């Protein structure tokens, strides 16, 4: 009635980090080598990584040495996998694995498995902005809202950087869809409404992207 | 490095039949080779080791030999409780190696997939998205090919696949393959295709239409 | 300088799990207790946890005692914090800290920081679907067999069941396994096959129930004008 | 648990002032007390720790003193690198406890909010989504609430703001609040209004649009 369990999977942007946890009931980890495995979604398992008592030795597959790690905890009875760098062949669900018998021999084959946990890699590491115009409807108000990027930074001028005075660029919110958005405004007189151009320079340098966007008072 | 190759890859029998599944290792590894029994969605369980060894609680159907670079494991009178994926695993003392599996499916005749696509409806059209769908209906065996055309143009990772399992009237497969886009690039094409390769078809099925008709 | 940098932030919803990990360099920690803290939106700091030299002490902040749990590995200098039922207010910036000065003694302040990670819970933990349907087209229809469905998407989390007819229609229904979507959302798709001449007086409704949601949705599929 | 209490929370200066902050414990803590400062978006920097020692490289304007149950950190001079938040911290062997931070910035006039209000523009519109911004432009102090009724119909859990930190040139503050809908939600109803509360005005201002 040995027991394992798994936490810490989802979804995770590529190059992204994501660590699992990996708790157990009815033994302790300390007299065991703990294993990852992983499911990949062709069906078949592929071994990931072993950690030995007292972490003596810790292998890892080819494809995850130097972005992998393996950690134990053996007075509280926890296993940790820390994956960073990610890549899409990382996609599978990861079990932690046992290695132990009724009598624990030198080489025991894996004789308890946690149900395991989803670990999803989305192919895209970065996405560029959509830039709409924040029109204007004395002192009058406008600007552009710069939404649904990923990641930060994202930096944004007015006129190549000619106008600079009433310039707010309001820091990034991240959006419940996992996207970054903003919105950068300007201060302007009324009158130079019909004659001076506003354009917003929008660059987000992860993507290499650059957005000039003008801004009229709509029709 | 060790590799262990599995054969076949895909083992098609019926209820109350004896099959082997074969073990081959680049090198010799004696006796140290395990069996696990996996079914979707479940964990591995540890069914053989040191490539004879039943584990406690293991039915006596199953059994296992074979040393150096040659192993198989046999079930004698498949139960439909068999029907699962099998791994056979070298393990070593701080490293492991797993085959690609075997999956044991019920066997049935070849049957050709039924195709139809579907446009993506107007509700969902406006809200932003349109979602184009293809279906594979009643199908056998489970490999099988879809590659979306549009405007004649094949498409690469905006699309997701989806499988069911062995029907238990029919023994057949189902796929659903989405390619999903804004409606700007909806709006952006005219004609959407799918393309079906499958060994039960003389050649591949084209099923598409024009965005608008 | 020593330097210290965590990683494993990010969206989380409400009830779900994330463990964050903390990376040195420059100095060992294994002669430094350990601290994780936490700057909430309203701009205080709040202690969370900390870890003793060998993980001889591990202590709490009763606001998340029982649903974290701190760890560390010396040999590879690196901290751990598991965040399980993780709620609203567990939303913050997280610091890895460490606690130490120029000599160590009995009792030093927290001499070196990350520089944090974002760690946002999201206060819904589940989503309604939104279904669509997949028509009979006027030419996707061969032989005497039509084939129409629909499309369940953008739901959280798993499962959903659909029946059709309200039970009636069993044969030739295929509720397909869901996808993950890159919005971190779900999506599936139900079809079933009928014979044609059945389009003009038999009326099908595809029944999804997400239970997670509680949500039921009874959508009809006729063919398009 | 030791609860440590931070006074004020927010102190207004000029540059040039001279400032305290003070840190009460409910329970004796002797000197086991430390002084952090903290920037948007940047990590804590230790200040001072056993109630009195400057940690090497802080500036001598810098002090701190104070036992038992009674703190203060004295900034004689301030300049403006100093215009950051506060906390002071209990550390013990084990545990610790901070103060709600004490914000210090430069203190101004109060300055009512600029309110301006922004529809969903057409071309993000017909992609689904619409986003309604609500602006507020110089204003003074930090506090205001934004409210969205939508058809007369508070908004709650649709709404997101932002604000950006003292401008180098007027010290004022200035709030976007961003309303994201769905397109068929946002061609559901007609008129959409951001109502502003803050205390440079008489009552709250709402600034509103009919959807065409
Ligand atoms: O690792 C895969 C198996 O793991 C579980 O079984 C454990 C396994 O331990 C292997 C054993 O290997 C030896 O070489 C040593 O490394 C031993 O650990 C020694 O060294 C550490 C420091 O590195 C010491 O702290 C230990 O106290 C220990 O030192 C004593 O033991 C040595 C070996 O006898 C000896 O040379 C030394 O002088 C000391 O007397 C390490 O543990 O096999 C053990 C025996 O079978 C078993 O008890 C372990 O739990 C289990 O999951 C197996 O199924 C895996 O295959
Ligand atoms: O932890 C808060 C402070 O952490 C840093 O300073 C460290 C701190 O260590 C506290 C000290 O407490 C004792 O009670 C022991 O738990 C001691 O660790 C002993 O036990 C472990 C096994 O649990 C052994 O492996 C150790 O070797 C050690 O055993 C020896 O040392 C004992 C203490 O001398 C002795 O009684 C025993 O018989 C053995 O000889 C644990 O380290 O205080 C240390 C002394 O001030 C300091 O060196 C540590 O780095 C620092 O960040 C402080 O600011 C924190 O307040």
């Known amino acids: 009635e040995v027991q394992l369990v798994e936490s810490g999977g989802g979804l995770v942007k590529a190059g992204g980090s994501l660590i699992l946890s990996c708790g157990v009931s009815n033994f302790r980890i300390s007299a065991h080598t703990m294993n990852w495995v992983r499911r990949v979604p062709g069906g078949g398992l592929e071994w990931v990584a072993s950690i030995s008592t007292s972490s003596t030795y810790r292998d890892y597959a080819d494809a995850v040495k130097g972005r992998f790690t393996v950690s134990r905890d053996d007075l509280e009875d926890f296993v940790y996998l820390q994956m960073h760098k990610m890549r899409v062949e990382d996609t599978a669900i990861?079990?932690?694995?046992?290695?132990?018998?009724?009598?624990?021999?030198?080489?025991?084959?894996?004789?308890?498995?946690?149900?395991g946990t989803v670990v999803t890699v989305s192919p895209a590491s970065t996405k560029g902005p959509s830039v709409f115009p924040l029109a204007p409807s004395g002192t009058a108000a406008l600007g552009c809202l710069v939404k649904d990027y990923f990641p930060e930074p994202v930096t944004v001028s007015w006129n190549s950087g000619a106008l600079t005075s009433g310039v707010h660029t309001f820091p990034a919110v991240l959006q419940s869809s996992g996207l970054y958005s903003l919105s950068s405004v300007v201060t302007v007189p009324s009158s130079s409404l019909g004659t001076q151009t506003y354009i917003c320079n929008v660059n987000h340098k992860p993507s290499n992207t650059k957005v000039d966007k003008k801004v009229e008072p709509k029709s | 490095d060790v590799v262990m190759t599995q054969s076949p890859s895909t083992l098609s029998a019926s209820v109350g039949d004896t099959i082997t599944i074969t073990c081959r290792a680049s090198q010799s590894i004696e006796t140290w080779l395990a069996w696990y029994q996996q079914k979707p969605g479940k964990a591995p369980k540890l069914?053989?080791?040191?490539?004879?060894?039943?584990?406690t609680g293991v039915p006596s159907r199953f059994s296992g030999s074979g040393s150096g670079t040659e192993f198989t494991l046999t079930i004698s009178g498949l139960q439909f409780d068999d029907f699962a994926t099998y791994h056979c695993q070298h393990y070593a003392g701080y490293s492991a190696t797993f085959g690609q599996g075997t999956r044991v499916e019920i066997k049935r005749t070849v049957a050709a997939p039924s195709v139809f696509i579907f446009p993506p409806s107007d509700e969902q059209l406006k809200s932003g998205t349109a979602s184009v769908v293809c279906l594979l209906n009643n199908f056998y065996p489970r490999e099988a090919k879809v590659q979306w055309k549009v405007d004649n143009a094949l498409q690469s990772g905006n699309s997701q696949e989806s499988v069911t399992e062995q029907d238990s009237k029919d023994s057949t497969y189902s796929l659903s393959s989405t390619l999903t886009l804004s409606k700007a690039d909806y709006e952006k094409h005219k004609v959407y295709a799918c393309e079906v390769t499958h060994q039960g078809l003389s050649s591949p099925v084209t099923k598409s239409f024009n965005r608008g008709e | 300088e020593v330097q210290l940098v965590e990683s494993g932030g990010g969206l989380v919803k409400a009830g779900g799990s994330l463990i964050l990990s903390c990376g040195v360099s420059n100095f060992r920690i294994s002669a430094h207790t350990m601290n994780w803290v936490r700057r909430v939106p309203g701009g205080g700091l709040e202690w969370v946890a900390s870890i003793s030299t060998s993980s001889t002490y591990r202590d709490y902040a009763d606001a998340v005692k029982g649903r974290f749990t701190v760890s560390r590995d010396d040999l590879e200098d690196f901290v751990y914090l598991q965040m399980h039922k993780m709620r609203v207010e567990d939303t913050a910036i997280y610091y890895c800290?460490?606690?130490?000065?120029?000599?160590?003694?009995?009792?030093?302040?927290?001499?070196?920081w990350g520089p944090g990670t974002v760690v946002t819970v999201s206060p819904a933990s589940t989503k309604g679907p939104s279904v669509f349907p997949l028509a009979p087209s006027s030419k996707s229809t061969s032989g005497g067999t039509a084939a129409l469905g629909c499309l369940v998407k953008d739901y959280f989390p798993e499962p959903v069941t659909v029946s059709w007819n309200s039970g009636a229609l069993t044969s030739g229904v295929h509720t397909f396994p869901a996808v993950l979507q890159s919005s971190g959302l779900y999506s599936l798709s139900s079809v079933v096959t009928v014979p044609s001449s059945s389009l003009g007086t038999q009326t099908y409704i595809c029944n999804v129930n997400h239970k997670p949601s509680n949500t039921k949705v009874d959508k009809k599929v006729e063919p398009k004008s | 648990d030791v609860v440590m209490t931070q006074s004020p929370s927010t102190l207004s200066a000029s540059v040039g002032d001279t400032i305290t902050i003070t840190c009460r414990a409910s329970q004796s803590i002797e000197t086991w007390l430390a002084w952090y400062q903290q920037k948007p978006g940047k990590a804590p920097k230790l200040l001072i720790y056993?109630?009195?020692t400057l940690k090497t490289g802080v500036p001598s304007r810098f002090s701190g003193s104070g036992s038992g149950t009674e703190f203060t950190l004295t900034i004689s001079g301030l300049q403006f690198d100093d215009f950051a938040t506060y906390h002071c911290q209990h550390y013990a062997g084990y545990s610790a406890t901070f103060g709600q931070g004490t914000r210090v910035e430069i203190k101004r006039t109060v300055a009512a909010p600029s309110v301006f209000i922004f529809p969903p523009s057409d071309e993000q519109l017909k992609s689904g989504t619409a986003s309604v911004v609500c602006l507020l432009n110089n204003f003074y102090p930090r506090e205001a609430k934004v409210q969205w009724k939508v058809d007369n119909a508070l908004q709650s859990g649709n709404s997101q703001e932002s604000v950006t930190e003292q401008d180098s040139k007027d010290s004022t503050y200035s709030l976007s609040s961003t309303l994201t809908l769905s397109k068929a939600d946002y061609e559901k109803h007609k008129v959409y209004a951001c109502e502003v509360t803050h205390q440079g005005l008489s009552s709250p201002v709402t600034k509103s649009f009919n959807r065409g």
């Open positions: 800290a460490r606690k130490g000065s120029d000599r160590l003694s009995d009792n030093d302040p927290f001499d070196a």
């Open positions: 056993k109630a009195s």
